[PDB]
Each structure stands twice: as C-alpha cells, then as structure tokens.
Amino acid sequence: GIREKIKLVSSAGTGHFYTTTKNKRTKPEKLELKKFDPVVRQHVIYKEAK
Amino acid sequence: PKIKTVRGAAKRFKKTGKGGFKHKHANLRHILTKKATKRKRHLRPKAMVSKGDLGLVIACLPYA
Amino acid sequence: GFEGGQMPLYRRLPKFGFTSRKAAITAEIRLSDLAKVEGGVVDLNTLKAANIIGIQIEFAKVILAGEVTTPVTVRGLRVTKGARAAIEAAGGKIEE
Amino acid sequence: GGSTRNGRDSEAKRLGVKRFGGESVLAGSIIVRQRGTKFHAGANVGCGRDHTLFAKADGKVKFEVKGPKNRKFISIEAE
RNA sequence: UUUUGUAUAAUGGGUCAGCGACUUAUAUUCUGUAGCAAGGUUAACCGAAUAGGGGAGCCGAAGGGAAACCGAGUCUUAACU
RNA sequence: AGGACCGAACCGACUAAUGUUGAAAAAUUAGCGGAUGACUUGUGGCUGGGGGUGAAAGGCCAAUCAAACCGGGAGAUAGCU
RNA sequence: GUUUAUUAAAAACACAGCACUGUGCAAACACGAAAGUGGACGUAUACGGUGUGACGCCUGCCCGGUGCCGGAAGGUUAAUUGAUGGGGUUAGCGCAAGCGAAGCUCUUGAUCGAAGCCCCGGUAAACGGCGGCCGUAACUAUAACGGUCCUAAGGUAGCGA
RNA sequence: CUUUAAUGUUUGAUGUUCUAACGUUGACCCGUAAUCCGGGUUGCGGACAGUGUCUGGUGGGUAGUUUGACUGGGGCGGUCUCCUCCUAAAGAGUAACGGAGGAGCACGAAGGUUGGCUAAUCCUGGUCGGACAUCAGGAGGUUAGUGCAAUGGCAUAAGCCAGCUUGACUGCGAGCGUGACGGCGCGAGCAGGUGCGAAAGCAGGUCAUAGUGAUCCGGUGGUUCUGAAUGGAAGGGCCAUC
C-alpha cells in the first residue's frame, strides 16, 4: 500500500515477527521495540521496522 | 432437476459426528492488526451453527 | 435462500471447499459384514473380482467394527490398530 | 445549534444489591466510569478496567453501612 | 360485499330454470397406524405378470481432522496442565 | 395579358338555429368562403405500421390509432387487484 | 397559398429579401445487404441544407466559459511492434545465503501511435453575457465629470403601460 | 571498432514513368433491327479507382438499463454508523423531525513499575515588567489537570517530577457477562521466558466510554497437506499476512 504497515523481525536470526499500524502524517520515525522470541525463548530488540 | 445442493453452502460447511455443521470465521484475512492477540487466539479454533440458522442450512444441504 | 433481509448465514461465511477426493474411491470393510469375501483372502490386485463397496475403487481399508470369528487372510491393504488385533484373534494373517 | 442524536443504549445493568451472588466470580452490577465509589473491603477483590462491581471470588454480597470517608463499602457473607 | 364499524342514501342485485372454485401425485416432517428388525428393500428388461428372476439401485450400522492420515478413538501442541 | 373584383353550375363545410336513445349511425333551414385554377372530378394504377400520408394538428391511414387490423408466442409479468 | 373531418383558418409554415454552411463531374448528398435508381439528360446564370423574414433606415460591445473553424510543433493514448523485470525449468562463480544466462514456457509491455483534447488565434447575422462604491450643480431633486473596485465586457440605434 | 564518401536486396511512405490487374463511369460489331447482359473489335483511363474488410479510437442519430431513505405528500434544512446526560414512568424494558453536546483518533510514547510531588484560581504585596505573566504570602480547591464531548472517576492518583523499563508478551483458561444472532466484555489458575520493587505485591497497553465497511477479489511468505495415468509446476487447502 501507501499508508504502510510495520513487520518488525527478530534480531536473533529467527523468522519470527510482529505486526502493527502507525500513522506517518504526524511524524515519520522508525520503531525500536523489545519483544519475545518463542524459538530462542527470550525478549530482544526487533529490527527492520518502518 | 431433482432438488439441488447449494454449492455456496457446501464449500462453507462440513458435517460433524452429531448432525451439527462446522465452519470458519469472517473478518480474519484482510485486517489482522485490529484484534488484540487474546481475541486472535480465540478465533483459531472454528465454530458450529446455532438453531437460528441450522433450520435453514439443513435444507440447503439436504444430502449431507 | 431468504430470511426477510440481512442475508442467510451461508452467504456471510468464508469458503474453503477442500476435501479428501479419496474417500468416495476407498472400500471401507467391516468385520460385522465381509460376506462378499466369505472369510477367505483379500488383496487389492484381485478385489475387483469380489466388487465389495463398488467397482470404481482405488484403495481398500479394514476398520474395527464388530467381531471376526474365522481365519481371514490379508495381503497388503490398510488395517487399523484394533482391526489387526481382531484378525489375529481369529487366527487370521496379515502379509506385508 | 443542532437536532436529534441521543446515543444507543448505554449498555449497563444494576443488580449487585441485598443478597445477590455468584458461583465462581461475584460479577455484581454492570456500572460505568467509577473505579471504587463502593469498592471491596474483604476477599471480594477486583473492580477492574470495565468499572463493573466484579469480584475475583465466589459467594453472596454483604453491606457494612460504613465507608472510608463518606461512601459505603461492599463485602461478602459467610460460607 | 367493502370497512374496525352499514337497515344505511357506500357496492351492487329484473324474471325463472339451468351452469359454476380447492381437484391428486411425488418428496419430507410432525401427528396417527401396522408389519419387519442388526438388519429391512430393487429400476428397466425378462416374466409361469406383478409373483419368480434381475443387486446396476436404496436406507441403517463410528468417529477426529482442511487434508495427509489415524480410528473407538482423534485435531490443535513445547505441553505435563 | 387575369394565382383579376363580384357571382351560378362546381367545391368547401366558417356562422346561427333545429335535431341530440334523430327522419339523418352530422342530416335539415337560411346565411358565408372559394368558383380558369397553389380549382375540381371519372377511371386504372403506386406509396403500408415506427411504415405510409401530412405547406405539420398527436391532424389523417376502412363505425378501431401517443402506434390500426388479424393468426401464434400467451395461461407475458404483479412486496398486486 | 397551406391547416387541427364533428372544440380552434391564425399572430403558425413558407417564398421573395439577407447571412451561414456542404458540393467541381463517376459532384456533394440520398436510397437499396445488392443488382438497380434519384440528384440530372442538371455543371455553379447549377445542386443539397440552417436561421431571419418583401420594402426603407439599419445590423451595438464582449471570444473569458461551452460549441464550431484555421494553424502548426510538442504532450497524452488505444492498435501493432517487443526492450526491461519477474514466475515454472535451469547452466554457472561463491560454504551456503547471494545470486543468475541462452532454449522451451507463464507473465509484464520500454517503444512506435493521424486527428481530437491541451496551446495560439478566429467565430456573438453561433450557445450565451451586457457589473459595485465614493465624491461632483449653495433651496430640493438628479448627475453632463474624476477617483477606486470587478472583468470577457458591462447596451450604440430604435421603440416603451 | 568507428566516423565519413558510398552501396546491393527487400519492405513501408512519397513523388514520377509504364501497362499485363481492374474499370470504361467511351464506341462499334455479334449473340439479336435486344435501350440490359455477355462476348468480340477498337480506343481511353490505370495498380489509383471500383468493391468488400477487420483492429483500435471517436462514437448517444440507435438500444437496453439505472432511479437512496426518513417524513402532517416532497425537494431545500436536519438525519442514517459510533459516544455521554435528560426524556426513562423511584424494577427489567424503552421512542420520533424530543431537549442538548461529541467521534471515524492520537500516543512505543502520553504504555508498565517503584519512590517523590499535588494541585487550579482569585486577592494583597512584588522588579526592568508592560493590572496580571520574575516571586512569595493569604484565601481556596477530589468543578485543577488528563486529549477530546458529556458524565463521572482519579491522591489505594489514571494528574506531573525522577529512575528503571516493554506483560502494547507466545500458548491456554475454570466460570460468568451484552445481544435475536453476527460482532463481543470480565476472569480464579496454569505453560514459555521476563520487567519494576527492599518486599508483600504490581504488569496479558493508554482515565472509562466514539476513532471505515462482511461474504467476495487479487497479491506476498513457510508447508514430510492436496495437485484426480507416474511427477514437477500453476490452482486449492493448513499456518502466517497486505
């Protein structure tokens, strides 16, 4: 699309990801969030966000 | 012509070992970010039809 | 197909449409039945001669329904957990 | 400066009074926007985000006819 | 006859004798009623005519799963819960 | 020399009355317009239904027309009488 | 002259006069699946069509909008051509990822593309449009005149209960 | 290899020159004292005509069709989904063009947690200072502040200061709750790994209530599912998702 949606991926080399929607018309900024990885069984920073 | 199976019902229902009919959920494949994950997990097991619609589905699928 | 308005449920659900396609072409044989093979021998390469469950069959399977009393002999096919144990309880043999 | 609109139904129901109860949770009255104007005084702990007079415990209600200020507590009767 | 409501000034209607509307078939559920029963039952065609032959045909007897596949058990699962 | 002025035959059918389930399925009485001509009439032919005819009015086309008549589709259809 | 047969003979239609527009000989224009016909035994001193209405004095200003016409370059774009990239298959260099070619094959469609339209101008005897405020003459009343505001431009002639 | 002077063979376009295609929209002769046709004979044009096409565009002269509703008939004005109060009859239930006002979002931070702080505003005095906005003092205030209507909560702060932080978790949920159903709310307790705190305990998103739309259609990814003679692939399913 053109509004886009976030697909934030595990930093532990896992294929695991999370999804979220975030408005860009207020400000454009990349998300740096800490989330659970069920394959290495820890909470880590997730990458490749919008 | 000899009374027909509604194929728009056949591709939407399977029959259970108790006479009732089992089906999928709507609003689940085009928007996925708008339900919280508790609601997401409770919409991974499927559903069965209630009496308010069974009394019509059992006539649209007469040979089921 | 009408309830005055708001659509029937059969027009407000997702389609999936996927099936076995093998079920209609599988001969499902019971221990309570089998009188078309008379407690003799069963092999899928000669089952057309007995025509049990039909003539346009591609698969054969025996299920635990009833009790068998005579030494029926199986050559290949499919037999379930309890069906094998019921055939052996009748002196019957399963050759694989 | 306008006409019509008045809201749908408010979606509330009051019944957690006298000796009302429950068998796993005492769900009480469905109430709005007040997190603890009655509030719990014993093992009847709860009253969460939905503001409903709900307790994480089973039994029937009791009223003590005193409160923290002002106001009046809600509790539960003997098992 | 309409209409909630008509002795109605609302609808018509002469005379008299005739004509003139809900009929029965298949499918199926409840209701009623018999026969058979873990078994009950064939179409066309033949035919000592509905019998006797004809089991292509029709119901009941297992379930879990999208399906592979499994089965008196089974899908989902790291899973005990 | 008259698409001359008036006016009979000849053509029209404007005005008033009568008749209006009539004597007449628009006829009669007395006026009025045109009357060698963008006039009229006998005979046989040609133009036909979204087609003719019309110097044009929803005027005219067989006692039928905002689409005539006749055989079939046809028992069109109807949150309707 | 023509006209609504039995509600209505005209102030309507039209010629004459004038503009506008199509047409050059196998005319345009027209019919008819077509053969065959009309225009025409016509040739522009001829033919098919729109408006206004003989005659006299006349024919206002506005082309910004919609329509029409003249101009020509370039843009956009369908047909068709088949570059670029990907999918099924797959050679081949890298541990592997990373990639990734020719053929068969599924898909895309770079690019070529008259005129219109966009642009510039023309056309109001095409469709149409023909605006505010302030000051100005010693009663009162109204402006022959400036200033500023709008714009495509703001009613000349003649007539007027 | 390339610039530059040329060039064969075809194929479009454009101009010119022919005549064997085609016409004759010229005539005579014959069939045949037939105004047509066809042939023949002789002239004249000419690869253009004359005839018939499909692609795509233009295409309303032609055809079929579409037409929101509410409601003292109707358009105009208001309104249709979602939210708060009064209407609402001192139970549950509840309405219109009743009386009024709002929303179709915004925040990884404005979220979670431990400690600290608690207001606002008026008034008197106060410095360039501008009644007042530096500041203190007095009164006063769960009607300040919060994001936003309204209502009501909020210090056991959800308001603002400091630090630490992501439980805005993957998988499940006893049992109860709104509704006709679709859609859906609360929740004892567990699994997998954690965050704040000295600790009990707190955390499965924001102060609670508004912040676009089903089936259907296409696309992206993982697959010891299926892919109908044996297979792959395309299509379909399961599990993810725009």
Curated annotation (Swiss-Prot), chain A:
Keywords: Methylation, Ribonucleoprotein, Ribosomal protein, RNA-binding, tRNA-binding. InterPro entries: Ribosomal_bL33, Ribosomal_bL33_CS, Ribosomal_bL33_sf, Ribosomal_zn-bd. The keyword Cell division does not apply. GO terms for molecular function: structural constituent of ribosome; tRNA binding. One of its GO terms (cellular component) is cytoplasm. Transmembrane segments: none annotated. One of its GO terms (biological process) is cytoplasmic translation. It comes from the Bacteria. Surface exposed on the 50S subunit. Belongs to the bacterial ribosomal protein bL33 family. Part of the 50S ribosomal subunit. Cross-links to the P and E site tRNAs. NCBIfam families: PRK00595.1 (NF001860), rpmG_bact (TIGR01023). This is Large ribosomal subunit protein bL33. It comes from Escherichia coli (strain K12). The lineage of its organism: Bacteria, Pseudomonadati, Pseudomonadota, Gammaproteobacteria, Enterobacterales.
Swiss-Prot record, chain B:
PANTHER family: 54S RIBOSOMAL PROTEIN BL35M, LARGE RIBOSOMAL SUBUNIT PROTEIN BL35M. Residues 9-21 have a biased composition (Basic residues). Keywords: Ribonucleoprotein, Ribosomal protein. This is Large ribosomal subunit protein bL35. One of its GO terms (molecular function) is structural constituent of ribosome. GO terms for cellular component: cytoplasm; cytosolic large ribosomal subunit. Belongs to the bacterial ribosomal protein bL35 family. The lineage of its organism: Bacteria, Pseudomonadati, Pseudomonadota, Gammaproteobacteria, Enterobacterales. Residues 1-21 are annotated as: Disordered. Part of the 50S ribosomal subunit. InterPro entries: Ribosomal_bL35, Ribosomal_bL35-like, Ribosomal_bL35_CS, Ribosomal_bL35_sf. It comes from the Bacteria. Signal peptide: none annotated. It comes from Escherichia coli (strain K12). The keyword Ribosomal protein applies. GO terms for biological process: cytoplasmic translation.
From Swiss-Prot, chain C:
GO terms for cellular component: cytoplasm; cytosolic large ribosomal subunit. This is Large ribosomal subunit protein uL15. Keywords: Ribonucleoprotein, Ribosomal protein, RNA-binding, rRNA-binding. The chain holds residues 49 to 144 of 144 of the full protein. The gene is rplO. This protein binds the 5S rRNA. It is required for the late stages of subunit assembly, and is essential for 5S rRNA assembly onto the ribosome. GO terms for biological process: cytoplasmic translation. Part of the 50S ribosomal subunit. Contacts the 5S rRNA. It comes from the Bacteria.
From Swiss-Prot, chain D:
Pfam families: Ribosomal_L27. One of its GO terms (molecular function) is structural constituent of ribosome. Part of the 50S ribosomal subunit. Cross-links to the 23S rRNA. Cross-links to the A and P site tRNAs. Belongs to the bacterial ribosomal protein bL27 family. One of its GO terms (biological process) is assembly of large subunit precursor of preribosome. This is Large ribosomal subunit protein bL27. The keyword Ribosomal protein applies. Keywords: Ribonucleoprotein, Ribosomal protein, RNA-binding, rRNA-binding, tRNA-binding. Residues 1-14 are annotated as: Disordered. One of its GO terms (cellular component) is cytoplasm. It comes from Escherichia coli (strain K12). PANTHER family: LARGE RIBOSOMAL SUBUNIT PROTEIN BL27M, RIBOSOMAL PROTEIN L27. InterPro entries: Ribosomal_bL27, Ribosomal_bL27_CS.
